[PDB]
Design a binder for this molecule. Sequence first.
Ligand SMILES: Cc1cc(Nc2ncc(Cl)c(Nc3cn(C)nc3S(=O)(=O)C(C)C)n2)c(OC(C)C)cc1C1CCN(C)CC1
Length: 266
Amino acid sequence: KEVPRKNITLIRGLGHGAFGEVYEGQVSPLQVAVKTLLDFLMEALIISKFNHQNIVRCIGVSLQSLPRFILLELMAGGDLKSFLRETRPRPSQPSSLAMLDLLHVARDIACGCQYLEENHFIHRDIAARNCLLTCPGPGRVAKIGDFGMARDICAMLPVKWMPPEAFMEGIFTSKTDTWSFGVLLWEIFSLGYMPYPSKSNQEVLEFVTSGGRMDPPKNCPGPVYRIMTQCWQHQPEDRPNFAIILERIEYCTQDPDVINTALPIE
Ligand SMILES: Cc1cc(Nc2ncc(Cl)c(Nc3cn(C)nc3S(=O)(=O)C(C)C)n2)c(OC(C)C)cc1C1CCN(C)CC1
């Protein structure tokens, strides 16, 4: 749990996290991500309560010295949104990334979602910016890296990932997680585009509450799009839970017409 800081050497800034900047770091020699700053406690104990292969591991905290640190598993592949964007196939080197790689990422996150659902934990912010990769190449494993707004129970709410009952009522349940997962899937299969690409948050609210949903990402196979559309059913009771989602993802991985489908080139 507590790590003095005598052992903690920072190495490089990684970018700006939820509360602050995150560093690649070491401990002794464990390479780690050092996340910085109730909430302090909320974030910390939460991710540390879990034990699952598709959730980032917590190594410890450094709390008696300031700034305050949570030390997490270092995910050498960075975040999923950046990965998909920098690995889009191009005209210059067009990439190794294929449909099956996309389905594996999807499968890894759902398996982490399914662990949460089974433990009655509501994420509240399933989105590609919160997903990390063990490494950039084949055999990469995707993990959930940050937990949502159990730091809660705002143009700051991630409306584009939220179902109606969540944005209009403040109702969050596993089925509101299912909705967000559908949107992630869209993010995955569009290769990192912003959801509802040409719309504002206010437009989206209006769009979605009256039944509007996103078109398939370009070249998205029908069976994958169908998972999204099922995740976006208006009534939460009609949404699939994560064991169904994973079952469906897994059929996708077994259908050649899905996995042989080529990614669009940029
Ligand atoms: C985004 C990012 C993350 C990691 N590794 C990492 N590992 C473990 C954790 Cl828990 C983690 N969390 C984290 C990093 N950042 C910026 N924000 C967070 S966050 O608040 O925890 C949340 C938004 C996931 N990050 C990374 O490391 C390797 C390349 C060495 C590089 C990037 C790069 C993305 C794009 N490149 C160009 C620069 C940073």
